[PDB]
Write a protein of this length. Structure first.
Lengths: 158, 158
């Protein structure tokens, strides 16, 4: 009975920790790439102002980053609704921004870029928070697991 | 002897995991804020091109983000040399960029911004990688801990 509970605990704690860790091996990547969307968005305005030849390539590059695996992989049952919903919004905002950029519309860009980037900012923040809650969970269960086993062994040994 | 090894293992595994996790509760924040430096850098060029009144505020805002606690806290013995060294570079590059921005020097900006942002990019990538190695470690020890205890209990029970 004593050892059964020690193994059960070791398997549960280790299992949940690894399952959460496995769903977090790309949290940092996501935050980086989501983050970059902000720079790319302002770099587009900078291209539009300097008449850079690179405008169209950056347009498509932003689109590619937006729809990167890591970010598309956020549309899964276990990723909170807030993250998936913010992502979806970004995806809609981009269509307008891109269309505006194709029509050379700097005045609309100047007027909207702050809000536009603020939204990306919120998204990135949600990823940040999400990644922290999960890391916390790992902490709580790794802790409780080491404590539980220490307690089970303390009484059993006694 | 059997239970002594089961507790020792539970304490080691849990200890190292928590110690690594504790040194990673702000990995996501770091990547976000380091990431933002990229956007802020291009937003500065955009201000400089549009003659925005916000130029000076963004200059100082970038400086404040650059020197944020989370990022200054990277200068510690247990953070790899590569991260601390890239950070230091950013800190030097900013002084030139800021001085150039004060003298209204768009031509130098246009010519250097890509390289300048590429460096921030590398920094952010190093933070990303660093955060992943640590998360891996947590995975490896949480795993080995649950396995070790399962094995210790299997033989002891047998």
């Amino acid at each position: 009975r004593a050892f059964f509970y020690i193994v059960l605990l070791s398997i549960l704690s280790t299992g949940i920790a690894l399952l959460t860790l496995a769903s977090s091996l790309r949290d940092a990547e996501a935050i980086n790439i989501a983050g970059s969307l902000r720079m790319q968005s302002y770099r587009l305005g900078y291209d539009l102002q300097s008449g850079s030849p690179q405008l169209n390539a950056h347009r498509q590059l932003f689109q590619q980053a937006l729809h990167s695996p890591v970010l598309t992989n956020l549309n899964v049952w276990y990723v909170p609704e807030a993250v998936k919903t913010r992502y979806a919004h970004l995806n809609a905002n981009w269509l307008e921004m891109n269309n505006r950029l194709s029509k050379g519309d700097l005045p609309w860009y100047q007027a909207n870029i702050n809000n536009y980037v603020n939204q990306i900012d919120l998204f990135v923040l949600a990823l940040q928070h999400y990644a922290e809650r999960k890391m916390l969970l790992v902490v709580a269960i790794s802790l409780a697991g080491g404590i539980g086993i220490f307690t089970l062994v303390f009484f059993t040994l006694r």
